[PDB]
Amino acid sequence: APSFPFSRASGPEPPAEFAKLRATNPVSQVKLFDGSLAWLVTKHKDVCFVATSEKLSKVRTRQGFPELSASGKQAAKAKPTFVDMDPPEHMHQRSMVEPTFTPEAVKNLQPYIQRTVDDLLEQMKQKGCANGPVDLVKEFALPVPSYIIYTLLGVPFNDLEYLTQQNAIRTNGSSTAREASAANQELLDYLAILVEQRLVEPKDDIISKLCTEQVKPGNIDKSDAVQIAFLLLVAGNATMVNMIALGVATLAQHPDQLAQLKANPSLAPQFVEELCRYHTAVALAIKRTAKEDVMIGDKLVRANEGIIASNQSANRDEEVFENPDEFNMNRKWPPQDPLGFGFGDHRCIAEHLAKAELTTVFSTLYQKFPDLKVAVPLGKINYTPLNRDVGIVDLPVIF
Numbered sequence: 281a282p283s284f285p286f287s288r289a290s291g292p293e294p295p296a297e298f299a300k301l302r303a304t305n306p307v308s309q310v311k312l313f314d315g316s317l318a319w320l321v322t323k324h325k326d327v328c329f330v331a332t333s334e335k336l337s338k339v340r341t342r343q344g345f346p347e348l349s350a351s352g353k354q355a356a357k358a359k360p361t362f363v364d365m366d367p368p369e370h371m372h373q374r375s376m377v378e379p380t381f382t383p384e385a386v387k388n389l390q391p392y393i394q395r396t397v398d399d400l401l402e403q404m405k406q407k408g409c410a411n412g413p414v415d416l417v418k419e420f421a422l423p424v425p426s427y428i429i430y431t432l433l434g435v436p437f438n439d440l441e442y443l444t445q446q447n448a449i450r451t452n453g454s455s456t457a458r459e460a461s462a463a464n465q466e467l468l469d470y471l472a473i474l475v476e477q478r479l480v481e482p483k484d485d486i487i488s489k490l491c492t493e494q495v496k497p498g499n500i501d502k503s504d505a506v507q508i509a510f511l512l513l514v515a516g517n518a519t520m521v522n523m524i525a526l527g528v529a530t531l532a533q534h535p536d537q538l539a540q541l542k543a544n545p546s547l548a549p550q551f552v553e554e555l556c557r558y559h560t561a562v563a564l565a566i567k568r569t570a571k572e573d574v575m576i577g578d579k580l581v582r583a584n585e586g587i588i589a590s591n592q593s594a595n596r597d598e599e600v601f602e603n604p605d606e607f608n609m610n611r612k613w614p615p616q617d618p619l620g621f622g623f624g625d626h627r628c629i630a631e632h633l634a635k636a637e638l639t640t641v642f643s644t645l646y647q648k649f650p651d652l653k654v655a656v657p658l659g660k661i662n663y664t665p666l667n668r669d670v671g672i673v674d675l676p677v678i679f
């Protein structure tokens with residue numbers, strides 16, 4: 281049994297092991313950091329099964345849960361939020377914050393998302409690049425998702441820049457454990473204050489709705505509200521940043537596709553669809569423990585055994601997506617759902633918001649800067665370490 285998680289084959293590539301497993305051993309055992317074994321599922325159909333089976337659990341206090349690191353094992357000791365819950369607890373808490381993320385709500389949020397993107401791009405243009413390239417991540421990919429989620433949560437305008445930087449520090453690869461932790465605890469402290477304030481004078485934001493609708497009636501306590509708000513912030517921000525950066529890098533790698541997008545920004549939705557399939561930046565979230573014996577393919581997963589269903593591998597499943605390793609924004613989509621946002625009950629709560637942010641970015645970025653170019657050879661892109669989910673640390677650009 282090989283050690284898992286695997287390392288990416290290269291900066292922009294997924295681990296090389298998956299393709300081989302899908303072809304000769306779709307459901308197999310892998311060895312985790314603590315020496316325990318877990319079942320690795322690599323085929324689309326099997327990943328979908330794992331994501332929806334009622335015989336599988338997300339509760340991390342169950343022995344056998346596939347924690348992939350020492351930190352994950354310690355983090356599993358805290359009171360859980362809906363991300364680590366099973367029915368009926370799961371939807372009971374998730375439904376407390378779903379309103380802002382529904383397809384209808386996101387459609388109505390479009391003008392705000394567009395203004396946020398327009399403002400950040402204008403700021404970038406005014407700063408210019410007359411003295412050399414600027415970091416697309418720091419100047420654009422980071423603030424876009426950050427400002428939006430912070431604003432939706434309830435953070436006032438003047439606090440956005442500092443809070444955006446602090447949240448970045450908690451996941452920055454250059455941060456020391458001490459710094460990441462400090463930033464983490466600081467964001468929690470700040471959210472605690474916001475909850476106290478919104479409890480007194482509610483405004484029109486997520487935190488206020490949690491206070492008025494859940495805390496006051498006694499459905500949850502203040503700390504619960506803080507943790508729910510915290511989850512909404514840290515769950516997908518870093519991923520959004522990385523997806524925007526990867527999108528720009530990808531377009532640079534395939535000139536004709538960029539030419540097509542520039543000539544027709546209406547193709548942004550399909551470009552985003554392909555991006556979320558090709559670059560599965562959240563590939564280690566579909567994990568479970570078997571509550572009872574369950575058969576998957578030619579294997580029997582016994583009660584209390586862990587399972588990791590790779591949506592990354594599923595998105596490269598040749599049986600579902602023709603020429604899976606080819607990035608094609610004009611891809612002819614099959615009836616099967618690509619799995620960039622998961623599947624089943626737990627499917628990303630912000631899938632629609634995320635897609636809206638990405639679509640707004642890629643339908644506007646090259647209209648603003650038609651000559652935007654990465655200022656370093658593409659082969660020198662600074663990607664996240666290979667033993668981590670795919671992403672980009674910084675991206676020098678000129679325009």
Ligand code: HEM
Binds near residue numbers: 374512621622630
């Ligand atoms: C393009 C960026 C994003 C990608 C690719 C992404 C992908 C995912 C994936 C794969 C999961 C696992 C779903 C499953 O268990 O089947 C997930 C869960 C989740 N994501 Fe995201 N996500 C993104 C953006 C966001 C944003 C913007 C937020 C916050 C506003 C967010 C909040 C969450 C939460 C709260 C969960 C847990 C849902 C649950 O367990 O019920 N995500 N996301």
